[PDB]
Write a protein that binds this ligand. Sequence first.
Ligand code: MG
Length: 364
Amino acid sequence: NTIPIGIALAQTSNVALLGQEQVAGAKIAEKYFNDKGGVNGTPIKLIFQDTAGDEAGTINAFQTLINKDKVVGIVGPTLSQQAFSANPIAERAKVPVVGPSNTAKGIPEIGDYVARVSAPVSVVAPNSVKAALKQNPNIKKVAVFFAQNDAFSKSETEIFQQTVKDQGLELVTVQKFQTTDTDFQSQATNAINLKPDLVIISGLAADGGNLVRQLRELGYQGAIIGGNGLNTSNVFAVCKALCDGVLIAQAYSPEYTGEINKAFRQAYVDQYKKEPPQFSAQAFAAVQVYVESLKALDTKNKVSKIQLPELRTELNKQLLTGKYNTPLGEISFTPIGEVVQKDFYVAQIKMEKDGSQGKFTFLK
Ligand SMILES: [Mg+2]
């Protein structure tokens, strides 16, 4: 006997450029927690249902997890775009959802069953603008790009634009693209003609990486910030050496000294031979929230005796009250499911000259 927890992530489509990291983190969590006896001796079992890259696929994954797999709760989906359409399904069904990477404004407000462990754009994004200004205090002109078809990108760009204004900088253009575009010649040239000192990009990974590469190809030599959708080494293949120098804010640091981060990091580095990415750590944290909440609930109200609808409701209630020492730091939730998290960072892509390898260097 095991306790089923649903994992609804993008395992296919270009959204899997983020989702793959999340699967890795979730699997590390499953082993870590089951090696500690699961839920008071009862193992958990992660049940994966691929969402693919769109809303319909996420709705289908959630419905399968809820109805066929009988899960006690869901971790997912990968994108805020997907969450706004699919999470109401879980809300109506009274099944908890913990978002691992949904950073748009409004996610926890979807309902009483929606929480997230992924710090939102309003708290994460401004630090990369501040870091850019530290590296070049003479930045004056800023060009902004965003994916107009993606809910997260639209929310993120609003924060970047406000931060640019508040820092006293000139917003010389806001250019739109689609996440499915591969070619950005016209937008990139339009921006370059305005002589920006800083370019900010809110998109996802394939699109963001292609845009970075093309800006550099077209002769842009200024600073670049990528938003959370570019926050993966999977961009390295796309922009190669031309990824070098991109600044990306972080809600996780491999060097954070919490004991569980040491354990998580060691497991990750031993397997994948590089430092754990943010998305992997956040996925681990989401699983952790469920395990520790299930343990607390089970101690007060043995879960093997609770029928599934009540188990789901009681699990949701419990998780919102918990305090968790996770790889992200000490986190908790507000009464509506927003994450409470104190520490943020900025990292910078450092590519080897040949362009075949790189890493994220954390700024001090
Ligand atoms: Mg909520």
